[PDB]
Structure 1
Amino acid sequence: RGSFVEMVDNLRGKSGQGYYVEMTVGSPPQTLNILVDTGSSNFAVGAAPHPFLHRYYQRQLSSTYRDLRKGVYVPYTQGKWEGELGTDLVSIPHGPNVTVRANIAAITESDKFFINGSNWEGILGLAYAEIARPDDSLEPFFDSLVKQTHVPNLFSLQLCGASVGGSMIIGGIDHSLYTGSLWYTPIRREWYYEVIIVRVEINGQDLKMDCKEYNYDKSIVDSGTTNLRLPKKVFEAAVASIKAASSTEKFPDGFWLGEQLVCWQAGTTPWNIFPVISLYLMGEVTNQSFRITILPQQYLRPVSQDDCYKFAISQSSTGTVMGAVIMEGFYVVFDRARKRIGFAVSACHVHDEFRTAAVEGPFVTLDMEDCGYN
């Protein structure tokens, strides 16, 4: 409890391409880099020589592979992966010193899934069985890990933005990774890591929307999404307020829609024209909330001889997505045992001399249960 030095710095990443952890599959162990994804629930790995892949799972080389004689087809947008299900022995070299027999989807065909030039070859879906493919009887990796070992039923993530890195602490918390106190919001339902946002402020100014809008049709914490994604109506209200706060300088209308970048010469980014963004989350106690605050350092993503940034807040039709834009400000504790998610100021988040990311409570917020969409 509290200190896991061997897992510190076990994540690496390229900006906008997610964070991955080294894993091994099969016997003898085959090493793969695997995207850490709290927004899905399948352990799926490249298993054929796709040109983009540095490497892939060669089941024929594993004496411990067991075929489940079942295929899985997984469309989404944009894209798809298809694979064959089995089990095999899985370890995390810079994780707990255990080995688990986990479900693995061997990806044999995909479209717009693997990224050309990325250093990961599969994804580790850390969410719950209710969104596993093909169905909730395919036990997710972390469920198997907890069933078969004594690893406590929780993990935590410190994503450090900018080559990026960070830490996945499996089975506990490392208090070096955060400053101040952890604040917890309930996991509303175990499918995604679903939470309830109860108030949104831009530079301290309330958007004053019916809070059910903030969670239309859900709000999730998702390490496998780059952006803060906001439901359309909330996004419209949000940019408008951000546009207004930031009007000392003017930017193309397309910038706010992510359709073009904006640049400034090096050292010349005007952070302070941009507002902070505060999400109040449902607390642990009736009528009690807390708030997490992020900087433009978080929602202006670095991507000419200038520092060009992408606006990393974007509209959504799947509800709010707290992606790397949120998570890079905080140490985030996925406290599965207590069905709650803790947030604390991250010891590694990017800021400036004037503003820091923040986690503050308690606040008095009534009718928070009304904020959840049904």
Structure 2
Amino acid sequence: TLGNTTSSVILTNYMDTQYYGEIGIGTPPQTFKVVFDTGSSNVWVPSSKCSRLYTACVYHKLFDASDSSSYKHNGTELTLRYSTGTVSGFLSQDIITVGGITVTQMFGEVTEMPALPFMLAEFDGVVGMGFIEQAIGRVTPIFDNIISQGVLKEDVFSFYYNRDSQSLGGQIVLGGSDPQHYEGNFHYINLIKTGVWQIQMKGVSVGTLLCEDGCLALVDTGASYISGSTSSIEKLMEALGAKKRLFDYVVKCNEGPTLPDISFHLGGKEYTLTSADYVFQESYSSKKLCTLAIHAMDIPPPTGPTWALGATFIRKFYTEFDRRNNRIGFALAR
């Protein structure tokens, strides 16, 4: 079942690492800054029931069930595990607005929210855009719920991530794509399987050094960076002349623009990033260090080992997520 509505969510670009939009939960709406994340499937926001001893709950918007006349209790415990951290809490049901679409949605009220990393979040919560199969507690994801309404023109959603300074930080179209933010044709790659926004990758090139037998690529709107496995990144970085630090790889800022192209071989086409697309050029000095927007992340089975194509990739390539045809479309962003 399909309608005729298309709907956009305006996103704020925080330091090229966090892309978030506004959603409203409850009656009247309590507003939250949320990351729309294709790598997970649960909605959560911090709870008023979160102990103030969690400092992250002091520094973020808290959902207060006691102020919502449309709240429906459930209370089942849930733990959501991400790459960079974990949240715990319980399930609740309420009205959620996103792009002027209202859905009754089960979501997590988070009562346990670690200061690292959640103090470093501009956003309050997460809206998972993954499939029900990856949803913790088998809770229906928000998009599946929007699909049930039969209002969207297509069973698709699209991401645009900008660079950044008083302009559009990003955009999610629910029900289509926006031609004003892409050019040329979409080139589609089918998913490995329905359930995960993951596709076959045929190779990674520096300047084909890596993934020469084929590997996996998670198209992850909630990942800031392009990530590969530890040994894959170690080899990638050796070729770039980049040195390892605790959380990132750095190159000396001067040698930044001279860094080779990195190409990802997806569904026939070759998706190339220049150094400008993956280096945080904050200086041109030899005596300063510059961070690369490519990280090591060992994603566990059964999803892993896999590469993750995050904001670094999506900035260059406007991404359409097709649920009806179980594929991902890429076009040149503008």
TM-score, length basis structure 2: 0.84
SS of residue matched to 2:136: coil
8 Å Cα contact 1:255-1:261 kept in structure 2: no
| Residue of structure 1 in register with 2:163 after alignment | 161
2:271 to 292, 314, 325: 292
Equivalent residue pairs, number:
315
Shift in alpha-carbon separation, 1:201–1:114, aligned structure 2, 3 A: closer
Query: Is 2:253 aligned against 1:263?
Result: yes
Instruction: List runs of 5+ in structure 1 lacking aligned partners.
Output: 244-250, 283-288, 348-374
How far, CA to CA, are the matches of 1:231 and 1:21 in structure 2?
30
8 Å Cα contact 2:13-2:162 kept in structure 1: no
2:113 to 107, 110, 123: 110
Moved over 4 A (4+): 1-4, 75-78, 302-308
SS of residue matched to 1:28: coil
8 Å Cα contact 1:235-1:314 kept in structure 2: yes
SS of residue matched to 1:146: helix
The one-character-per-residue Cα deviations of 1:106-160 (angstroms, maximum 9, x if unpaired) are 11112256632643111111111112113xx211111111112422321000111
Q: CA deviation at 1:23?
A: 0.4
8 Å Cα contact 1:158-1:167 kept in structure 2: yes
Q: CA deviation at 1:80?
A: 2.1
| Residue of structure 1 in register with 2:264 after alignment | 279
Q: CA deviation at 1:301?
A: 2.6
How far, CA to CA, are the matches of 1:240 and 1:260 in structure 2?
11
| Residue of structure 1 in register with 2:47 after alignment | 47
| Residue of structure 2 in register with 1:142 after alignment | 143
> Which amino acid in 1 is paired with 2:147?
V
Q: CA deviation at 1:26?
A: 0.7
| Residue of structure 2 in register with 1:301 after alignment | 280
How far, CA to CA, are the matches of 1:2 and 1:263 in structure 2?
49
The one-character-per-residue Cα deviations of 1:25-45 (angstroms, maximum 9, x if unpaired) are 111111111111111110010
Of all paired residues, the percent bearing the same amino acid is 25
> Which amino acid in 2 is paired with 1:235?
I
| Residue of structure 2 in register with 1:24 after alignment | 24
- After superposing the two structures, state which structure 1 stretch, 156-165 or 81-90, moved more: 156-165
Shift in alpha-carbon separation, 1:242–1:192, aligned structure 2, 3 A: same
How far, CA to CA, are the matches of 2:229 and 2:17 in structure 1?
23
How far, CA to CA, are the matches of 1:58 and 1:254 in structure 2?
43
Shift in alpha-carbon separation, 1:166–1:209, aligned structure 2, 3 A: closer
How far, CA to CA, are the matches of 1:101 and 1:209 in structure 2?
43
Q: CA deviation at 1:75?
A: 4.2
How far, CA to CA, are the matches of 2:283 and 2:269 in structure 1?
41
Aligned pairs for 1:2-41 within 5 A:
7=8, 10-15=10-15, 17-41=17-41
How far, CA to CA, are the matches of 1:305 and 1:336 in structure 2?
44
| Residue of structure 1 in register with 2:332 after alignment | 345
SS of residue matched to 1:328: helix
Aligned pairs for 1:216-255 within 5 A:
219-243=217-241, 253-254=243-244
How far, CA to CA, are the matches of 2:323 and 2:311 in structure 1?
20
How far, CA to CA, are the matches of 2:290 and 2:136 in structure 1?
35
2:298 to 317, 326, 329: 317
8 Å Cα contact 2:16-2:163 kept in structure 1: no
> Which amino acid in 2 is paired with 1:325?
T
Q: CA deviation at 1:191?
A: 2.8
| Residue of structure 1 in register with 2:74 after alignment | 68
> Which amino acid in 1 is paired with 2:252?
V
How far, CA to CA, are the matches of 1:20 and 1:326 in structure 2?
17
8 Å Cα contact 2:158-2:320 kept in structure 1: yes
8 Å Cα contact 2:84-2:117 kept in structure 1: no
Q: CA deviation at 1:296?
A: 1.3
How far, CA to CA, are the matches of 1:209 and 1:104 in structure 2?
37
RMSD: 2.8
Aligned pairs for 1:332-371 within 5 A:
332-347=319-334
Shift in alpha-carbon separation, 1:115–1:290, aligned structure 2, 3 A: same
> Which amino acid in 2 is paired with 1:231?
S
> Which amino acid in 2 is paired with 1:222?
D
The one-character-per-residue Cα deviations of 1:235-264 (angstroms, maximum 9, x if unpaired) are 233233333xxxxxxx6x336982556335
TM-score, length basis structure 1: 0.76
The one-character-per-residue Cα deviations of 1:39-86 (angstroms, maximum 9, x if unpaired) are 111001011355433321111111111112311123455432111112
Q: CA deviation at 1:103?
A: 1.1
| Residue of structure 2 in register with 1:180 after alignment | 184
Instruction: List runs of 5+ in structure 2 lacking aligned partners.
Output: 300-305
Shift in alpha-carbon separation, 1:100–1:208, aligned structure 2, 3 A: closer
SS of residue matched to 1:99: strand
How far, CA to CA, are the matches of 1:108 and 1:257 in structure 2?
27
